[PDB]
Design a protein around this nucleic acid. Sequence first.
RNA 1: GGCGGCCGUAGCGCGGUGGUCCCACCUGACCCCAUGCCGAACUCAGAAGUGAAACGCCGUAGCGCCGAUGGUAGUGUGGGGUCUCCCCAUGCGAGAGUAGGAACUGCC
RNA 2: GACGGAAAGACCCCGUGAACCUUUACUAUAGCUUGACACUGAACAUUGAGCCUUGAUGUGUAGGAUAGGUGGGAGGCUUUGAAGUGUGGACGCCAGUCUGCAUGGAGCCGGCCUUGAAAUACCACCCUUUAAUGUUUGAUGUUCUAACCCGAAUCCGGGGACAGUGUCUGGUGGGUAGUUUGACUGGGGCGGUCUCCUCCUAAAGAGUAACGGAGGAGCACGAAGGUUGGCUAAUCCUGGCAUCAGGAGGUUAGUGCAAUGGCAUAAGCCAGCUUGACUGCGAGCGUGACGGCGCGAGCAGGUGCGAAAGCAGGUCAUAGUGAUCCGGUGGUCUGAAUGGAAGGGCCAUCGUCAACGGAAAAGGUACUCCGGGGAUAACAGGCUGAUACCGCCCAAGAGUUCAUAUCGACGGCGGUGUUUGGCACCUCGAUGUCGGCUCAUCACAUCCUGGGGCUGAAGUAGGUCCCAAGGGUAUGGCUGUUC
RNA 3: UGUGCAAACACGAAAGUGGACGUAUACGGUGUGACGCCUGCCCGGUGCCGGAAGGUUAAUGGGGUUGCAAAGCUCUCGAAGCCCCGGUAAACGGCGGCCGUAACUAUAACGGUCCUAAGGUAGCGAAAUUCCUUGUCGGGUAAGUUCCGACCUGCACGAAU
RNA 4: GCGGAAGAUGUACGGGGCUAAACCAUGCACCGAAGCUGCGGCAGCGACGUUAUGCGUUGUUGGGUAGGGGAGCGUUCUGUA
RNA 5: UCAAACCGGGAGAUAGCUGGUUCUCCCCGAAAGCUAUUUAGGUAGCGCCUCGUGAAUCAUCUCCGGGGGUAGAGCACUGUUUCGGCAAGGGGGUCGACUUCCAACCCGAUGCAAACUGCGAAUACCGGAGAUGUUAUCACGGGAGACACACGGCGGGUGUAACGUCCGUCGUGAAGAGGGAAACAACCCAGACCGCAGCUAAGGUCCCAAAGUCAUGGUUAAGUGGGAAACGAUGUGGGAAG
RNA 6: GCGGGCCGUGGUACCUGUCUGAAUAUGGGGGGACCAUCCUCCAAGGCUAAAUACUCUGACUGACCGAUAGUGAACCAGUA
RNA 7: GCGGAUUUAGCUCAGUUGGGAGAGCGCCAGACUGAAGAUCUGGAGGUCCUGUGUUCGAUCCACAGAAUUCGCACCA
RNA 8: GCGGAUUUAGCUCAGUUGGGAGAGCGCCAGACUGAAGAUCUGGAGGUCCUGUGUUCGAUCCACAGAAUUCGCACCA
RNA 9: GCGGAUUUAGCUCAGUUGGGAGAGCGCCAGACUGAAGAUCUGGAGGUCCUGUGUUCGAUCCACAGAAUUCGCACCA
Lengths: 84, 52
Amino acid sequence: AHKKAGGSTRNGRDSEAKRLGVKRFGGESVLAGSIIVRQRGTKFHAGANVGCGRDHTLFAKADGKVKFEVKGPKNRKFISIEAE
Amino acid sequence: AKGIREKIKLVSSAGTGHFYTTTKNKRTKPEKLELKKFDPVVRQHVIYKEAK
RNA sequence: GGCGGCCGUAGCGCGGUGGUCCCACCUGACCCCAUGCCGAACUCAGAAGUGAAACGCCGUAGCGCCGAUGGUAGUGUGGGGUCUCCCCAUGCGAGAGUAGGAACUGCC
RNA sequence: GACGGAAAGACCCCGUGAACCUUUACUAUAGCUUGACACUGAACAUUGAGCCUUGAUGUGUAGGAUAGGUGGGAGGCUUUGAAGUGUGGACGCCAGUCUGCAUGGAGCCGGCCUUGAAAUACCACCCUUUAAUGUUUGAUGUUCUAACCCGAAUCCGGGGACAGUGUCUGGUGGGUAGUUUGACUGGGGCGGUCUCCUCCUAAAGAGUAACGGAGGAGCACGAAGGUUGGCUAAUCCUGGCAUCAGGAGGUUAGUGCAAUGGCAUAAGCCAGCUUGACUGCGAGCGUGACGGCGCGAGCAGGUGCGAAAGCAGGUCAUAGUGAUCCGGUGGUCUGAAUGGAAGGGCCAUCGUCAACGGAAAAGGUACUCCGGGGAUAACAGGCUGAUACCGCCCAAGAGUUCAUAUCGACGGCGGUGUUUGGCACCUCGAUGUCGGCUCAUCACAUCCUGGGGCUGAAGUAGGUCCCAAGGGUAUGGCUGUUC
RNA sequence: UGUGCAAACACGAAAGUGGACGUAUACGGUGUGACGCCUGCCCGGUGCCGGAAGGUUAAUGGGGUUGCAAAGCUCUCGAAGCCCCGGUAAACGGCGGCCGUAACUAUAACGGUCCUAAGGUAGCGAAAUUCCUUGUCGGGUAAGUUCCGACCUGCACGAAU
RNA sequence: GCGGAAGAUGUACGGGGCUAAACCAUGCACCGAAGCUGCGGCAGCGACGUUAUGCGUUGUUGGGUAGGGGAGCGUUCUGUA
RNA sequence: UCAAACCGGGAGAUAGCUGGUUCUCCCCGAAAGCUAUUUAGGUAGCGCCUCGUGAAUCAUCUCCGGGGGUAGAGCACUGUUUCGGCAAGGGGGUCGACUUCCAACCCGAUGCAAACUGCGAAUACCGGAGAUGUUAUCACGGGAGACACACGGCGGGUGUAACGUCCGUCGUGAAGAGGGAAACAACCCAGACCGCAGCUAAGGUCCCAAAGUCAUGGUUAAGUGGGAAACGAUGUGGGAAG
RNA sequence: GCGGGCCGUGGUACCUGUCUGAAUAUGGGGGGACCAUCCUCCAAGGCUAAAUACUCUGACUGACCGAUAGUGAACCAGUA
RNA sequence: GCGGAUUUAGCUCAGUUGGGAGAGCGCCAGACUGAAGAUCUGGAGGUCCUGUGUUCGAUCCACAGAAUUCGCACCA
RNA sequence: GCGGAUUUAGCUCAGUUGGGAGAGCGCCAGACUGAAGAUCUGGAGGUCCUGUGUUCGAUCCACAGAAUUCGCACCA
RNA sequence: GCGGAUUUAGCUCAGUUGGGAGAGCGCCAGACUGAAGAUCUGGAGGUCCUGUGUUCGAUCCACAGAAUUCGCACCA
């Protein structure tokens, strides 16, 4: 029933996450990256996370959310190639 | 398996359709009351009834 | 008070002061409308009484956050000795400390 | 001494080796009993079943219901072959009428045809059942009789359809035979572990072990699903631990589940409403190719809710699962030639393997052998030394008084490695085991004596410690035994 | 303990055969194994054998359902043996623990209390069959885990194991 | 630097032996490798030219168990010269 | 010859078991993981040797655009724990005041952590551009070895322990000459054609021994020249301070 | 129809054993499933030449071996 | 999974006439005994598995579901 | 040392839907009996091993410790 | 030597919330009985092994020593 024996997490397996989505070439409106599921907002390149910063570029395609509160979960404002 | 348990397997009966539908039903009332409107691989909007 | 600009140092607390121009409180619920039980909510109306909670200004930097001038421990990296261990070269520098900003700016 | 030569251990483990006997092992084969089929005919008695004929029709307690029955009632107008009646009999046990019987009062038919305890007329359905009889038939028991068996030369006698026996099925069945029954493992054994999820360990990606320390999943649920409105919690304080009113309160609450992460004018709570757990088809994701499965993200057509964007591919995310063969369930295809059936596939769901990537089911082995291996222990050596032995530092306290003059706790620091436990690199392709005995060779952390230190050394007598081999350590009873 | 014999028992694939040129004052299958004292407690849990309401027990045929036939589903009816109960321990066996009374102390002895029914009185017992046990008392000896006698709660000794 | 330190048939840094022929802090010249450089004779890989894996030139130049690849000669009998 | 005969016969039985396995020279020159297999001292698709084909431009030693959070540090979960001050509760002694003791909270100094943090590396690492390189990277397919590394030292983790299991650093056995270190797997320096010349490295340079009994300065005197410790010392030299 | 053997034999090979049991050419069987309708052919009786094998024996041949080679046997050998 | 049996007041069970729910034991009380025991008498105690259907009315019919038990099947 | 079981009112023991602490015997008393006995009725009798943790609340969960018992290990 | 248990008022023993030293028996007395007995009641009787340490205070903690008992260990 209830839990006991204080402690941090509870040991698991090997992390299953990647980082697909060069976002500097062709990019179909889809999840740019892989780490944690469930999240929306970003419709284009919006790489912005606490620290030195983040970025992406060129790719004309409406909508394109991220993974979640990870690699720049924040939602910036539009961005594309240079002249689609 | 089969016996005295909540969940129970029973296929629907659209009527003229080709049946095929999996939906269990525990013992907590209601009893004689399947579900509702379904859309089997056939005409649009067809009768339901998962009971059998 | 109206009307703009810049536009996360405007997070969050706290002080003084002013306009019966303005604004919430407040007041009254005849009606539109509305509350599972309560016009409290919701919605409508009038303005007796204040500023005790907005707003205009303006005074503290606590705390959060964003920048700047100074530097020990710690630490990156490659050679030296030495029983362990420690040293040197070189890029920085815990964290503490000294300061900057509580708006800024135009018009009626 | 050349770890001499030589005759490759029976101790021990290993090698999915061998054999033996033996269980509450599996699979079969003889044999025994019995039913039935072929070898078992006739007579008598019993029981079951099917069919035929004959007789009667087996069911129960009170006027609103009568009665196989039922819902409609009671003295209501028209039915087969003499009996109806009122006081008269029978073959299997109980009633209404039927026949050649015998007659009167009961009326001619009739009885019949409106009383509570005694009550109505016409063509399939629970009876349609039961009871009796004749024919066919199944099982059991008895008698008789031809087969068969034995004795005898024969006649014939004894036994007797029990059999003798052939075949098959089910049960029981050590009476007989095999370790086949995995692994890891501080040798092995005992004790603990082999699927899966989620910290630490894994030493900032990733990935990463051990009977590594902590803790769980094998399900549950129509709602703990979705949407909307309102609301926001723990906990503490005050007035009255249940409740209510006020204040403080990012939240430590709660959110199904082992934890982390997320969330409050909220994915939390309360209430209402409602139910996207839809169909079809693609692109992408799992360093490095590899399926099922899963997830994120579109398109085409359409279900729910919302104003709409939008949200769903079940429950915030990560454990709750499993092939082939076969069977049970949903459209089609398929066998000289046709009809009627039985059979043979594509996709998907459900049912079992939780010793859970998965066998239908347990055990001893000193008579041992062989092919190998240190990747397997019980000794000796080596490391460590917690244990063991001894010393040192500080020193309470005891000692009549007086720590320090024997003894000396607590605590701390060391040496030896004689003891023991014992981390398997050395030898088990093997330096056969303890102790003693006997025999040869090479040394010292000692009791008396001798020379010394301390003294709880006044003296004496003792305690403790150092030194020393120079000489001497020469003996018995019980036990195979070593101390 | 089995058997009057075309017997029991045993051998063989069969034909046949051993024991029978025998016959129960027989022979086959076993335990004990002399002699002497002997001989106490329990059947709750196997094998064999006998009886046995009810339950369990194929296929053909028969009945119902299904299908203008047929599959399939299902009912009904069932020997020997077995479930049933009982007997049997010269059947495999089981016999732990506690309190009180009472003693200078410990034990034995007796009853109960509990567990699993009884819990052991003949003898004799730590005995080649008891760990603990070089058990306790003692003989004997200078001393003897040896031995003998006794007590004896009998770890895992005990009745033709 | 020293006290805390007793044991095995003859004792000492390789020896002699050295106040440095020790040791410590530095430094210089040599002997000393099949090292490095120079004269006469190679292999593999790649580049240039080439039909060429034949030559010429150019960069790297050459240790090896297990193992991979390749060349070779001793040999018998039967062709054609 | 028997817990089971002899001879021959269908055996040149089957084994994931041992051993065996012989001419010269030249080039290059290992590894000890994953999925599945009646499979685990075996193969196939793959981490590694070699050869042929195919494609194509990086890769990484660098730099640049991301993700992790350990060491350490700080101070941190939890469960302990040091002192003082303040407030509230309970008990005891005398007065409804105070004193003493115990538990919880806050602050400062003190600090604590195998399951933390106001802060915070190195570092490894996903995607895209360069000096370098231009055909390397990378894509395909064939034929293999292969998924039994260990030991010593140091730091460990599990472990009440055995000539370990399992990680980390380093180093060797591997694939290393030559050479010194007296001898020596790893310490230092430095890398093999032939014959030959010169000059250096290892190390050595007084003699045997080939090379200076070489330069400047200093120490020790102990012959120390090498085991050595918790502990003691006006042996001696130097420096600061009352 | 029951119980088996065997075969590539599948409910569709062949044969053995027990039981049951036809019709008849205005008949019946077969064409790899069963039953009515086509085509083919007719069992339950029998006989039947020809086309490959081995190698004792005779002869020949062989880029076969050469007397620890080759058949065990070129010498008494299947003898000592 | 398949089939059979069973599923009545605490316990063990009878009850197919569809129209009475009952017995033994147990529990309480009474009588009796000095009393306690045992007889003996009396009382209480039943969603007669559950739902639905059939009938006027069903424990006692039909259908569906569940429990218990046995045989069988599965138990890579 | 290791693992398993056990550790409830005097004794012997039941008690997992976590929310009732109960049975037999014993002890005291009542009743009865002349009385004592035996029933029978009533009462008392329980840190339900200990501490802590978990929950709204635990004898009935988790952790740690102690005791009893058994197997094993050790024993010049 | 090593390991375990034990070491409370005369005897046999209980007593861990650390802060009460208690019971049975025995001894003395009372009540009762003619009296003695047995019940029943009362009283006395404790360096709770010894020292030291831990605490506000220990029989009930820690350490050391002593005694008893058992196991183990070892005899020219």
